[PDB]
C-alpha cells in the first residue's frame, strides 16, 4: 500500500514503542488536530480507510495533513512453525503511534465538520482519540 | 584557402579542387592573365600564388559560397511555399515524377510488405 518502494534490510527491529511523544507535540498545518491516547502500531489498512473516509466527508474544500507515515514494516511467520530455523517473513508495513502525539490536522472548513470527521476517523482507528483546537 | 592541391599534376585542374570554383572562372582568369599552367607539376612557384588567390577572390570564395547557398536555402525554406516544404523534407523540387525513381536522396531501398491477394 502506501509505503516506501525500497528498504535496505528485510527484517528491522520490532519497535521501541513505549513512551509518550517524540516530536509532533503540537498542531502545525491544520486547525483541528487529533491526539492519540494509546501507544501501539497501526497497519496501513486502517490508515487508508480513515484517509478515504476523511477525503469523502471533506473533499478539497478543506485540507487535512497527516503528520505520521508507515515508516516501518513488520514480519509475522505463518502457522505450523517449530521455534527456530531463521526469523519470520515480512507481511506488511506499519506505523508506530505513541500516546500523546498528533497525526491528523485539518483546516479550511468550519469547526463542526472538523469535529465530525475527527470523531469518524477516531472510531475507525483502533487508538482512542482526543481533539485539539489550533491556537497561535 | 592556400592548401588544396593534388601532388604533381596540372595546376589548371588542381585549382578546381575547391568546393565552389569550377573550370569556368579558373580557366577564364588563367587565360586572361596568361600564366601558361605547367604540365604534370603541382606548382611552379609562389611569386603569383598570392596574386592568383587575390584575383580568384574577386569572383567569389568557395567557403563563402557555402554560406551563400546555406542562406539562400534557409530563406527559400522560411517563406511559406511548396519549395520550402519540398526542400525541408529532402525531396526533388524540380517537378520530376516520383514513383520509385529519384533514389539518390532517399538512401537505401526500404520496404517490408504490401497488400496480398488470393
Amino acid at each position: 500500500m502506501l509505503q516506501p518502494k525500497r528498504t535496505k534490510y528485510r527484517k528491522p527491529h520490532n519497535v521501541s514503542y513505549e513512551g509518550k511523544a517524540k516530536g509532533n507535540s503540537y498542531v502545525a498545518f491544520g486547525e483541528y488536530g487529533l491526539v492519540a491516547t494509546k501507544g501501539n502500531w497501526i497497519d496501513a489498512r486502517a490508515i487508508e480507510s480513515a484517509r478515504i473516509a476523511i477525503s469523502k466527508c471533506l473533499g478539497k474544500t478543506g485540507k487535512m495533513w497527516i503528520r505520521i507515515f508507515p515508516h516501518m514494516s513488520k514480519t509475522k511467520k505463518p502457522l505450523e512453525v517449530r521455534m527456530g530455523s531463521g526469523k519470520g517473513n515480512p507481511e506488511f508495513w506499519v506505523a508506530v503511534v505513541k500516546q500523546g502525539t498528533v497525526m491528523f490536522e485539518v483546516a479550511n472548513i468550519p469547526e463542526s465538520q472538523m469535529i465530525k470527521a475527527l470523531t469518524r476517523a477516531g472510531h475507525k482507528l483502533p487508538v482512542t482519540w482526543k481533539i485539539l483546537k489550533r491556537e497561535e | 584557402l592556400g592548401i588544396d592541391i593534388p601532388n604533381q599534376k596540372r595546376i589548371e585542374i588542381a585549382l578546381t579542387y575547391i568546393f565552389g570554383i569550377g573550370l569556368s572562372r579558373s580557366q577564364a582568369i588563367l587565360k586572361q592573365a596568361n600564366i601558361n599552367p605547367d604540365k604534370r607539376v603541382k606548382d611552379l612557384t609562389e611569386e603569383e600564388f598570392v596574386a592568383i588567390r587575390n584575383v580568384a577572390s574577386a569572383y567569389k570564395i568557395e567557403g563563402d559560397l557555402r554560406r551563400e547557398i546555406a542562406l539562400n536555402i534557409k530563406h527559400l525554406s522560411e517563406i511559406g511555399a511548396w519549395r520550402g516544404l519540398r526542400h525541408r523534407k529532402n525531396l526533388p523540387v524540380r517537378g520530376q515524377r516520383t514513383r520509385t525513381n529519384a533514389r539518390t536522396r532517399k538512401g537505401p531501398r526500404k520496404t517490408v510488405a504490401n497488400k496480398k491477394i488470393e
Binding site: - | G2, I3, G63, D64
Partner: protein, 175 residues
C-alpha cells in the same frame, strides 16, 4: 622581438590607460598549455607517437601524456592508457607559440568570421581552438592520416578578464 616590444610598450600603455598606482597591477600572461585528446583507437591508431613527435618538434619543451584519472564507460580505458598529450610552456617558447598563432595560424584559416566575444570563463581565462593540423609555420604535411586540431588557453595573475581582452586587442587579436 614581440616579447620585448610587449614589455616595453604595452605595460606602460595599460598603466596609463587603467589607473593602478603600481606598475605590477597590469595583467601579465603566465603560461600556455596544449592538449589534444585521443579517442579514435583503443590503444593504437598510430600509437599517438606522431602527435607527440610533432609537438616535440614544434615546442622547446618535452611532451608528456596524462593518465586516466576517471574510469571510462564508453570504452575500455582504465588505470592509464594514455590519450592525448600535455605541454605546459612559459618563457620564450610561450612567445614563439603566440607569434606563430597571431601571424600564421589565424591567417592560414580557410575562412574566419571574427572572435573574442565570449571566450571567457568569468574568472580570467581565455581559450583558442584550431581545427587544422597544418596551421602552424612548423608542421609537416606527412603526419597521421587524420587531420587533428588543438586547444590552448591563456591566463594571467588576475581575474579581471576585461583587461585581458584589452591587452590581447593590443596584441593583434580579432574583435
Amino acid at each position: 622581438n614581440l616579447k620585448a616590444h610587449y614589455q616595453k610598450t604595452i605595460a606602460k600603455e595599460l598603466q596609463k590607460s587603467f589607473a593602478f598606482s603600481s606598475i605590477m597591477q597590469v595583467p601579465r600572461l603566465e603560461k600556455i598549455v596544449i592538449n589534444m585528446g585521443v579517442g579514435d583507437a583503443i590503444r593504437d591508431s598510430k600509437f599517438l607517437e606522431s602527435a607527440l613527435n610533432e609537438l616535440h618538434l614544434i615546442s622547446g619543451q618535452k611532451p608528456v601524456a596524462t593518465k586516466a584519472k576517471n574510469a571510462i564507460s564508453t570504452y575500455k580505458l582504465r588505470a592509464g592508457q594514455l590519450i592525448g598529450c600535455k605541454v605546459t610552456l612559459r618563457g620564450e617558447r610561450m612567445w614563439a607559440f603566440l607569434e606563430k598563432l597571431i601571424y600564421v595560424a589565424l591567417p592560414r584559416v580557410r575562412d574566419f568570421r571574427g572572435l573574442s566575444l565570449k571566450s571567457f570563463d568569468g574568472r580570467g581565462n581565455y581559450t583558442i581552438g584550431i581545427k587544422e593540423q597544418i596551421i602552424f609555420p612548423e608542421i609537416v604535411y606527412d603526419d597521421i592520416k587524420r587531420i587533428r586540431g588543438f586547444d590552448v588557453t591563456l591566463v594571467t595573475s588576475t581575474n579581471k578578464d576585461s583587461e585581458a581582452l584589452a591587452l590581447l586587442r593590443a596584441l593583434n587579436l580579432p574583435l
